[PDB]
Amino acid sequence: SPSICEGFVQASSQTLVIIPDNERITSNVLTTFEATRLVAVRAQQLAINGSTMLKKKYSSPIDIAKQELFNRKIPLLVMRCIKVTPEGQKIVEIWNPREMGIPLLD
Amino acid sequence: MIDQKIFETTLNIDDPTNFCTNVEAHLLKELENIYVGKCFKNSFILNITGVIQRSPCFIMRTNNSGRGYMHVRFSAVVSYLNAFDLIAAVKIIKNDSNIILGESLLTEPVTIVIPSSESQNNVAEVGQIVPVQLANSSVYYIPGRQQASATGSIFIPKHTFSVYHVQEELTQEQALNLTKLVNIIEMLLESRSKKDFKQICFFEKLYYTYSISSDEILDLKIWKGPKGKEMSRLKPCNVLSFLYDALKNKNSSLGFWARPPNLLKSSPLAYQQDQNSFNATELPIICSAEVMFVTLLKEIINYLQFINDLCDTFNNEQLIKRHENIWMLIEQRKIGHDF
Amino acid sequence: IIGKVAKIKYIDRSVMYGFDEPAVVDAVMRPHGPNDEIFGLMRLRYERNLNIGD
Amino acid sequence: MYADLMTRTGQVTSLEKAGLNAREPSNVLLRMALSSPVQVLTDAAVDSAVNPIYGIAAPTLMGSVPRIGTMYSDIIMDEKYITENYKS
Amino acid sequence: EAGYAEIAAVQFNIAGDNDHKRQGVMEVTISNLFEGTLPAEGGIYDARMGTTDHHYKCITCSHQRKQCMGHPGILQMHAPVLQPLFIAEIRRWLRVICLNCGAPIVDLKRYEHLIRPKRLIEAASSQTEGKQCYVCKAVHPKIVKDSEDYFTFWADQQGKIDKLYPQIIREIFSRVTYDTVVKLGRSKNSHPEKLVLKAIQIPPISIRPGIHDINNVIQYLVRKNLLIPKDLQIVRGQKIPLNIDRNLQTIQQLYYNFLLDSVPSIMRRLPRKEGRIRKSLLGSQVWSISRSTICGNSDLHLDEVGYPISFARTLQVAETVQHYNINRLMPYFLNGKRQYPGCSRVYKQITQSVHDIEGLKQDFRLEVGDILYRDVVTGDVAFFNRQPSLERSSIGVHRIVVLENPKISTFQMNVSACAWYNADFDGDQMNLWVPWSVMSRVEAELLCSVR
Amino acid sequence: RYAVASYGPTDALTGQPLDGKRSHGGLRLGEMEHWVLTAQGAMQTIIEKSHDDSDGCISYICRNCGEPAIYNASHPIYKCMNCDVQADIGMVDSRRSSIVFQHEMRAANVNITSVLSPRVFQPA
Amino acid sequence: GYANRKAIFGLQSCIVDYYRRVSIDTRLVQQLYGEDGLDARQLETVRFETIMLSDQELEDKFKYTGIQSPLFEEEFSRLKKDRDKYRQIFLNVENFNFSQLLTDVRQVPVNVASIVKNILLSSTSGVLPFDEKSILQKYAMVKTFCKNLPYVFINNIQERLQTPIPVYLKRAASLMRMLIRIELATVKTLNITCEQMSAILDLIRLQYTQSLINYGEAVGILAAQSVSEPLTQYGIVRPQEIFSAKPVEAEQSSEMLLRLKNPEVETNKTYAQE
Ligand SMILES: [Mg+2]
Ligand SMILES: [Zn+2]
Ligand SMILES: [Zn+2]
C-alpha cells in the first residue's frame, strides 16, 4: 500500500573508535599497496598545490612524492578498518607511514 | 520564532593540504558560504553557532582527483515559522489577477503569496504594508531557496476564543522548561518598554477587538487590564505570576481556562475558572496543563512580537496616514459596546 | 572526397577519407544502378612496398 | 584455495550456480552476473533481498570500484603534521 | 553542495502503483510523438523525461545529453494489468487465501517452522481445491493456468469456469491482512496487492534513445489503452462484449511482451554474453589506446617496448603546470603540433575550456594550474597487453622507447619478454595504452612493472 | 594498425565509445582484462580506463529514501521526487551503463534502493 | 574457457584481511592464507638434511661435544623432536594418498644455508679461536630468535611487550623454526662471530617480512588463474566431477586402494592375488 521509501530508514551515523597505539595488531611495515597509494595520493595533491618540505628540487610530482616517502616527510596517515560493530562503531588502527617500514619499490 | 538546530553534512575539500593548515577556521568559512541564508531540512539557516563533531579528512576513493571530504555535525541558529503565524510587515510587489505577491521586511526572508480573490485585488496595491495571518503547514522550506514559500491572509482580529479543560497539575520540571518562554516574554516586554507610548497605544487601540473611550487600556508597569465597567466578577490572572507561584507549588492549575477577545492578547493576563461558564461557541477540549501553558506562552509571544513589529515598522505618522486604509479596514471589523 | 547535399536549407551528407595513410584517386565513374539511379563509384589506390611487420 | 572454499559451510558445495547460492545467497548482484539475471532478479524482489557491496562483481555492477588492492586501506590527512610544518 | 558518498548496500523490492506515481515526473496522455522540432508535450517523447537530442535541455534537471540520466513518467491504465515478472507469485498466492474473505485456508501454524522464503512455496504446493473456508464457509475452487498464454487464470468451481480479470484478482488480494503476509513467509513490502498494476511506469528516454523499436511497443500500448472505457468495471462472473475481451487481452499481451518477449524486450537486454551485464558493465570500450603487430628487437631491454613515433603523437600525457615543472614543459608547448616532441591541447583552469595548440591565441600563456597534453617520450611507462589474458603477467608495464624512423609501424620488444605474454613473432598483435593520469602513472611504475 | 585518443564517436545508449577501427571508436578492455588488473591490485588504473576513458558519470542519491535525486549547481535545483523537503543528496561516482542498467530493472517493476555509507564522526 | 569463468566467479570474493585470513566479506574461508601466510612469488626450495638420517648419523653430525653443559643436550633434543614430528606428519600424508611419497625438500620463505655461507666467504676472519662465552651467547640468540619468530605475523609493538601469541600463528612458524635450528646449529656456526650472527638473524627476519601476503589481495582470482592454466594441457569428465561436486553414483572412474592387514604378509604376491 505505501511506497518503499516510507519504511526505509537511512543507516545511522557511526563513531570512530581508535585502537590505542600499544594494542595495535597489524604490521608496522607498509604493504606494497599502501605505499603505492600513499605515493599516488601525494603526487596528485602536489599536482594541485606544489608545497613540500623536500629540500632537494625535482621537476615531477612523482619524484617528489617518492622521495618524501623514502625520507619520512609524507603528510598522510593510514587508516586500517578492523570492524564495524552493529551498535554503530568503526574500530580502526591509525598508522604513521613516517614511522613504519617501507617495502622494496625498485 | 528563533531557536537552535543540529545538522549533519559532508563537505568536499578541493585542496586538502591547504585546508588542513587550519581546520576549524576553514570549516566554519565553508559552512557559512554554503548554508547561511538558505533553506535546508525544513528550516532556514541564519548563523553557524559552531561545529559539534567532525571526522578526519578522508581522501576520495572512487576517482583519481586526490580531493578530500569531511563529515560535519554543526549547530545552527534557525528560524522556523509556525502554522497560522502573524507577520506585521510586507511590501506587495506583484498584484495581478491570479496571485498577490509580497515579501517580509522585519523578520527573516519570507515570501508570501496571497491567493488573489475578488475582494482582495481591489484593496491591496503595490507599495503597501499590511499585517498577514498564515495558515496550516503552508510554509514549505524548499531546500536550496532563499525564502519560505507560504500563503497568508490579511489579518483582522478575531471575535472568537477557545476554552480548553485542564485536569492535570503543572509539575516543577515542565515549569523549568517553560522558564525559557517566560524569559522570552520578559525580554520582549523590556524591549517594548523602550518604545514610544503613542505608537504602542495607537496600534493597541487599532488591533483591540473592541473600542474604548481612550486612555483606559494600558498599565505597562502593573498590567491591571481594561477598566471597562468591571465586565467580569473575577480578576484576570497573570500567567507569569501563576507560573512563578507554581514553581514553588502554591496554586493549582486545574479547571477551565480561556482568553476572551476582550482580554488583552499582548498582556500576560488570562482567565481561570473551576467551572465552565465561558460564552465560547466551541466545545471545550479536554487536555493536560502542559499544552495549555505552551500554547498560551506561544500566543503571548506572538502577540508581543506583532505589537513590537508594528511599532518598529511605523516610526512616523506620515507612513501611518499612508497606510490608514488598512487601519479603518480593521476598524470596521471592531465590535461596539452594544451588549 | 565525394560531395553530397540533400534538400531538406541543406544538410551536408558528404564523405570523408578516414584512413591513416594517404591514397590516390585512380578512377571515378558515374554508372547507373539497378533502379537506374546515379551513384558515385570511387577507386583509391595505394603504393605498397614490403615493410617491417609484413 | 579451492578446497577451503568448497568446504567452508561444513558441506561440500560446487563451483556452479548452486554452490554460489549456498555460500553467498544475499549477493544478488554477483549471482546475476554469472548465469541468469532475470530469474535471480525475480527471486530477489520477492524476498526483498538486501545486498551488501563487497568483493568484485557487486561494486562493478553498481558503477564503482572494488575495495581491493591499492584501495583496501583508507588514507587520511596528517593534520598535526601539516599544521606544524606547512603554511597557509 | 552534494557531498561525496559511497553505496554500501542495495535493496530489491516489488514496485507498486504508489511507487510509480511518486517517482514519476509527468503523465503520458496523448499519442502524438512530435509537434515540431520539439517533442509533443504529454507524449512518450516529452522532454520532462530527459533529452536524447543535442539542441534542447531536459526540462526536469536542465542538463544537456551527457549530464542528464533520465526521469520516468506515468501512464494511468484504464484497466488493471498483472505484473509480468511475478505471474508465478500471483498464481501461488491464489491457492493459499480465500477468494471471498481473504483469510487463509491453509494452516498457518503448520509452515511456520521452516525458513521464511520457502514456507509460502510449500504451502501453495499442497493441494487445496475443494477445501472450504473457515470464517466465511466458502469452497476454494480449482485455479487453472491457461496453456494459450502466460498470464491468464481460470477459476474452476466444480465445473463452473471463470476467467479471473485483474480487477477481480486485485479485489481478491486487497482483502488480505498484513498478519497473513508476514507469518506466511513474505515481508511487509511483498504484499500481494502490489502484484496488480493500474499505473505503469514509462522508462526515461535515455534508456530508449534513437527516436529503438521499444518505442513502437510503447506507442501501440498507449493507443490501445485509450480504446478501453474510462470507467469499465468488472465483477466476478460478468459477461463482456468480445471486442473488449479482445482489447483487454491485447493490452496485457503488449505489456507482457514489452518486458519478457523471448527472454524487443526490456529484459532481453540483460542475459547473454552480448547483454548489458557482460558486455557493457563487466567490460569496456576505452579511449587512448593503440594496437599493432609485434616484432623482435634485441637492442631493447626486457622491460622496454619500442613505440612508433606516429602513435606517440596520437596518445598524450597530461601534465599540470606548476612552478617546479614550468621550464621543462616549455619546450613541448613551443613545438606545438609541428615538431616532436610537442603537444596538442591546453586546459585553462581560469576558463574551464580546452584549446587546440594550433588554433590558439597569440597572447596565450601557460598559467599555474593549466593542464598541458604533451606527446609520449622515451621513459614513459605503458601497459602492454596480449589476449587472451589468462595469467596476471598478461598485462605488464614497460618503459617506452620511441622509434623515430617514420617507416616502422610495429610494437617492438625483446625476445626474452615473450614468456610473460605467451607470444611470438608470426603475426601476433598486442594492445598498448599509456597512462596519462598521475595516479595511474604512479601505480603503473610501482605496482605493475614487469619485474 | 590502430591508435585513438581521448575523444570520438560514442554509443547513444551506454555512453561508451563505438566498436573499433571500422567505426573510428575505441578498443575493448574485456571481462578477462579486468580480472588481470584486479589480481594485480591496480585499482587506480581501472578508474582511468573504465571511468575516465569509457563512460564514467556522476550520480545523485538521496540519503533518506535511497532513490536517485535531481541536482544542478548552475541553475540551482536540489530536489527529491520522494521526500522533497528532507532531501539529503550525496554524489556517488558511477558510469552511464550502470545507471541504464538500474532504469531497466525499474522498468520491469523492480525497485532499487541504494543505501549510502553512513557518516563517521570522531568522538566528542 | 568455460570452466575458467565459473572458477573465477566462485572464488573472486576471497580477499586477504588485516589478520592475513581469507574471508568472504566477514565469513572466514582460511584462518591464514596458504596456512603459512606467504606470497607464492617469494618461496625458495630448500632441503632439510635431518629427515633421512639415523640416530647414529644424527648423533655424529649435529650433537656438539666441545663444551660439557646441559644447554647443548637440550639443543640436540629439539633436533630429534623436530625430525620425528616431520616424519610423523608426512608419513601420515602418504597414508591417505595414492602415490604421494615423502620428501625432505620444502618451499620456504628464507634459505638460511645460503645466508650463512655468503657471510663465511665475505668475512675478514678465518678459523676463530675457541671461546666458550662466545658459543654460549650465540646459542642464546638463536634460541631467543626462534621463540620470538611468530611475531613476524603481528608487529614489533607486540613483540616488545611479549603479549601472548595465538596457537595458529605458532604453527605457522614451525617450518622456519625447524630450518633455523638445523642450519644454525653449533656444529655449523663455530666460526661465526657474535656481531656476525646478529647480522645473520636480522637478515632472516627482514626476508621473512618481505615474503608475507599483502592485505587486500585478491587471492581467489590468483588461484582461479593458476589452476585453470594446467587444465589446458589435460576439460575431461574428471575435472567436471570435482568442480561440480557430483554424487557417488555419477562417478565414472571411481577407485580404491586397500592395504593388507599385516606388514609381514604384504611381501607375498600370491597372498595378495588370493
Ligand atoms: Mg603467433
Ligand atoms: Zn534530466
Ligand atoms: Zn529522498
JSON list of N, CA, C and O in Angstrom, two decimals, chain B residues 191-216:
[
{"chain": "B", "resi": 191, "resn": "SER", "atom": "N", "xyz": [11.99, 45.17, 25.81]},
{"chain": "B", "resi": 191, "resn": "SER", "atom": "CA", "xyz": [12.20, 45.87, 24.54]},
{"chain": "B", "resi": 191, "resn": "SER", "atom": "C", "xyz": [11.03, 46.79, 24.21]},
{"chain": "B", "resi": 191, "resn": "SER", "atom": "O", "xyz": [11.24, 47.91, 23.74]},
{"chain": "B", "resi": 192, "resn": "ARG", "atom": "N", "xyz": [9.81, 46.32, 24.45]},
{"chain": "B", "resi": 192, "resn": "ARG", "atom": "CA", "xyz": [8.63, 47.13, 24.18]},
{"chain": "B", "resi": 192, "resn": "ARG", "atom": "C", "xyz": [8.59, 48.38, 25.06]},
{"chain": "B", "resi": 192, "resn": "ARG", "atom": "O", "xyz": [8.13, 49.44, 24.61]},
{"chain": "B", "resi": 193, "resn": "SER", "atom": "N", "xyz": [9.07, 48.28, 26.30]},
{"chain": "B", "resi": 193, "resn": "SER", "atom": "CA", "xyz": [9.07, 49.42, 27.20]},
{"chain": "B", "resi": 193, "resn": "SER", "atom": "C", "xyz": [9.91, 50.58, 26.68]},
{"chain": "B", "resi": 193, "resn": "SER", "atom": "O", "xyz": [9.62, 51.74, 27.00]},
{"chain": "B", "resi": 194, "resn": "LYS", "atom": "N", "xyz": [10.95, 50.31, 25.88]},
{"chain": "B", "resi": 194, "resn": "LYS", "atom": "CA", "xyz": [11.77, 51.39, 25.34]},
{"chain": "B", "resi": 194, "resn": "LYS", "atom": "C", "xyz": [11.04, 52.16, 24.24]},
{"chain": "B", "resi": 194, "resn": "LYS", "atom": "O", "xyz": [11.42, 53.30, 23.94]},
{"chain": "B", "resi": 195, "resn": "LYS", "atom": "N", "xyz": [10.02, 51.57, 23.64]},
{"chain": "B", "resi": 195, "resn": "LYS", "atom": "CA", "xyz": [9.34, 52.21, 22.53]},
{"chain": "B", "resi": 195, "resn": "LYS", "atom": "C", "xyz": [8.48, 53.37, 23.02]},
{"chain": "B", "resi": 195, "resn": "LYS", "atom": "O", "xyz": [8.23, 53.54, 24.22]},
{"chain": "B", "resi": 196, "resn": "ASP", "atom": "N", "xyz": [8.03, 54.19, 22.07]},
{"chain": "B", "resi": 196, "resn": "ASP", "atom": "CA", "xyz": [7.20, 55.34, 22.41]},
{"chain": "B", "resi": 196, "resn": "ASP", "atom": "C", "xyz": [5.83, 54.88, 22.90]},
{"chain": "B", "resi": 196, "resn": "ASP", "atom": "O", "xyz": [5.31, 53.85, 22.48]},
{"chain": "B", "resi": 197, "resn": "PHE", "atom": "N", "xyz": [5.26, 55.67, 23.82]},
{"chain": "B", "resi": 197, "resn": "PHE", "atom": "CA", "xyz": [3.92, 55.38, 24.32]},
{"chain": "B", "resi": 197, "resn": "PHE", "atom": "C", "xyz": [2.86, 55.53, 23.23]},
{"chain": "B", "resi": 197, "resn": "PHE", "atom": "O", "xyz": [1.97, 54.68, 23.10]},
{"chain": "B", "resi": 198, "resn": "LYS", "atom": "N", "xyz": [2.94, 56.61, 22.44]},
{"chain": "B", "resi": 198, "resn": "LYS", "atom": "CA", "xyz": [1.87, 56.91, 21.48]},
{"chain": "B", "resi": 198, "resn": "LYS", "atom": "C", "xyz": [1.76, 55.85, 20.40]},
{"chain": "B", "resi": 198, "resn": "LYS", "atom": "O", "xyz": [0.66, 55.47, 20.00]},
{"chain": "B", "resi": 199, "resn": "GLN", "atom": "N", "xyz": [2.90, 55.36, 19.89]},
{"chain": "B", "resi": 199, "resn": "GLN", "atom": "CA", "xyz": [2.86, 54.34, 18.85]},
{"chain": "B", "resi": 199, "resn": "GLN", "atom": "C", "xyz": [2.19, 53.06, 19.36]},
{"chain": "B", "resi": 199, "resn": "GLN", "atom": "O", "xyz": [1.26, 52.55, 18.72]},
{"chain": "B", "resi": 200, "resn": "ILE", "atom": "N", "xyz": [2.64, 52.56, 20.51]},
{"chain": "B", "resi": 200, "resn": "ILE", "atom": "CA", "xyz": [2.09, 51.31, 21.03]},
{"chain": "B", "resi": 200, "resn": "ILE", "atom": "C", "xyz": [0.62, 51.49, 21.38]},
{"chain": "B", "resi": 200, "resn": "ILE", "atom": "O", "xyz": [-0.19, 50.58, 21.20]},
{"chain": "B", "resi": 201, "resn": "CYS", "atom": "N", "xyz": [0.24, 52.68, 21.85]},
{"chain": "B", "resi": 201, "resn": "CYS", "atom": "CA", "xyz": [-1.16, 52.94, 22.18]},
{"chain": "B", "resi": 201, "resn": "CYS", "atom": "C", "xyz": [-2.02, 52.94, 20.92]},
{"chain": "B", "resi": 201, "resn": "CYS", "atom": "O", "xyz": [-3.08, 52.32, 20.88]},
{"chain": "B", "resi": 202, "resn": "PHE", "atom": "N", "xyz": [-1.57, 53.64, 19.88]},
{"chain": "B", "resi": 202, "resn": "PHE", "atom": "CA", "xyz": [-2.35, 53.69, 18.65]},
{"chain": "B", "resi": 202, "resn": "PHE", "atom": "C", "xyz": [-2.51, 52.30, 18.06]},
{"chain": "B", "resi": 202, "resn": "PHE", "atom": "O", "xyz": [-3.61, 51.91, 17.64]},
{"chain": "B", "resi": 203, "resn": "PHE", "atom": "N", "xyz": [-1.43, 51.50, 18.05]},
{"chain": "B", "resi": 203, "resn": "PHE", "atom": "CA", "xyz": [-1.51, 50.16, 17.49]},
{"chain": "B", "resi": 203, "resn": "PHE", "atom": "C", "xyz": [-2.37, 49.23, 18.35]},
{"chain": "B", "resi": 203, "resn": "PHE", "atom": "O", "xyz": [-3.12, 48.40, 17.81]},
{"chain": "B", "resi": 204, "resn": "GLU", "atom": "N", "xyz": [-2.30, 49.37, 19.67]},
{"chain": "B", "resi": 204, "resn": "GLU", "atom": "CA", "xyz": [-3.11, 48.53, 20.55]},
{"chain": "B", "resi": 204, "resn": "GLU", "atom": "C", "xyz": [-4.60, 48.86, 20.41]},
{"chain": "B", "resi": 204, "resn": "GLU", "atom": "O", "xyz": [-5.44, 47.95, 20.33]},
{"chain": "B", "resi": 205, "resn": "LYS", "atom": "N", "xyz": [-4.94, 50.15, 20.39]},
{"chain": "B", "resi": 205, "resn": "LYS", "atom": "CA", "xyz": [-6.33, 50.53, 20.12]},
{"chain": "B", "resi": 205, "resn": "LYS", "atom": "C", "xyz": [-6.79, 50.07, 18.74]},
{"chain": "B", "resi": 205, "resn": "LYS", "atom": "O", "xyz": [-7.95, 49.67, 18.58]},
{"chain": "B", "resi": 206, "resn": "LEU", "atom": "N", "xyz": [-5.92, 50.13, 17.73]},
{"chain": "B", "resi": 206, "resn": "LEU", "atom": "CA", "xyz": [-6.33, 49.63, 16.42]},
{"chain": "B", "resi": 206, "resn": "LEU", "atom": "C", "xyz": [-6.62, 48.14, 16.45]},
{"chain": "B", "resi": 206, "resn": "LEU", "atom": "O", "xyz": [-7.65, 47.69, 15.93]},
{"chain": "B", "resi": 207, "resn": "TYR", "atom": "N", "xyz": [-5.74, 47.35, 17.06]},
{"chain": "B", "resi": 207, "resn": "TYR", "atom": "CA", "xyz": [-5.85, 45.90, 16.96]},
{"chain": "B", "resi": 207, "resn": "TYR", "atom": "C", "xyz": [-6.58, 45.27, 18.14]},
{"chain": "B", "resi": 207, "resn": "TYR", "atom": "O", "xyz": [-6.61, 44.04, 18.25]},
{"chain": "B", "resi": 208, "resn": "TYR", "atom": "N", "xyz": [-7.16, 46.08, 19.02]},
{"chain": "B", "resi": 208, "resn": "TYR", "atom": "CA", "xyz": [-8.06, 45.56, 20.04]},
{"chain": "B", "resi": 208, "resn": "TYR", "atom": "C", "xyz": [-9.36, 45.15, 19.37]},
{"chain": "B", "resi": 208, "resn": "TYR", "atom": "O", "xyz": [-9.81, 45.78, 18.41]},
{"chain": "B", "resi": 209, "resn": "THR", "atom": "N", "xyz": [-9.97, 44.07, 19.86]},
{"chain": "B", "resi": 209, "resn": "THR", "atom": "CA", "xyz": [-11.21, 43.60, 19.25]},
{"chain": "B", "resi": 209, "resn": "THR", "atom": "C", "xyz": [-12.32, 44.64, 19.40]},
{"chain": "B", "resi": 209, "resn": "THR", "atom": "O", "xyz": [-13.06, 44.91, 18.44]},
{"chain": "B", "resi": 210, "resn": "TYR", "atom": "N", "xyz": [-12.45, 45.23, 20.58]},
{"chain": "B", "resi": 210, "resn": "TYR", "atom": "CA", "xyz": [-13.48, 46.22, 20.85]},
{"chain": "B", "resi": 210, "resn": "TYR", "atom": "C", "xyz": [-12.86, 47.62, 20.78]},
{"chain": "B", "resi": 210, "resn": "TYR", "atom": "O", "xyz": [-11.68, 47.79, 20.49]},
{"chain": "B", "resi": 211, "resn": "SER", "atom": "N", "xyz": [-13.68, 48.63, 21.06]},
{"chain": "B", "resi": 211, "resn": "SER", "atom": "CA", "xyz": [-13.26, 50.02, 21.03]},
{"chain": "B", "resi": 211, "resn": "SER", "atom": "C", "xyz": [-13.54, 50.68, 22.37]},
{"chain": "B", "resi": 211, "resn": "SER", "atom": "O", "xyz": [-14.54, 50.38, 23.03]},
{"chain": "B", "resi": 212, "resn": "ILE", "atom": "N", "xyz": [-12.65, 51.58, 22.78]},
{"chain": "B", "resi": 212, "resn": "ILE", "atom": "CA", "xyz": [-12.73, 52.20, 24.10]},
{"chain": "B", "resi": 212, "resn": "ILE", "atom": "C", "xyz": [-12.64, 53.71, 23.96]},
{"chain": "B", "resi": 212, "resn": "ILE", "atom": "O", "xyz": [-12.24, 54.22, 22.91]},
{"chain": "B", "resi": 213, "resn": "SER", "atom": "N", "xyz": [-13.03, 54.42, 25.02]},
{"chain": "B", "resi": 213, "resn": "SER", "atom": "CA", "xyz": [-13.03, 55.89, 25.01]},
{"chain": "B", "resi": 213, "resn": "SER", "atom": "C", "xyz": [-11.69, 56.44, 25.51]},
{"chain": "B", "resi": 213, "resn": "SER", "atom": "O", "xyz": [-11.64, 57.35, 26.34]},
{"chain": "B", "resi": 214, "resn": "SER", "atom": "N", "xyz": [-10.61, 55.87, 24.99]},
{"chain": "B", "resi": 214, "resn": "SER", "atom": "CA", "xyz": [-9.25, 56.39, 25.15]},
{"chain": "B", "resi": 214, "resn": "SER", "atom": "C", "xyz": [-8.72, 56.28, 26.58]},
{"chain": "B", "resi": 214, "resn": "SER", "atom": "O", "xyz": [-9.48, 56.37, 27.55]},
{"chain": "B", "resi": 215, "resn": "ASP", "atom": "N", "xyz": [-7.40, 56.08, 26.71]},
{"chain": "B", "resi": 215, "resn": "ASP", "atom": "CA", "xyz": [-6.69, 56.16, 27.99]},
{"chain": "B", "resi": 215, "resn": "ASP", "atom": "C", "xyz": [-7.31, 55.28, 29.07]},
{"chain": "B", "resi": 215, "resn": "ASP", "atom": "O", "xyz": [-7.43, 55.70, 30.22]},
{"chain": "B", "resi": 216, "resn": "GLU", "atom": "N", "xyz": [-7.73, 54.07, 28.71]},
{"chain": "B", "resi": 216, "resn": "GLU", "atom": "CA", "xyz": [-8.32, 53.16, 29.69]},
{"chain": "B", "resi": 216, "resn": "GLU", "atom": "C", "xyz": [-7.94, 51.70, 29.46]},
{"chain": "B", "resi": 216, "resn": "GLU", "atom": "O", "xyz": [-8.68, 50.81, 29.88]}
]
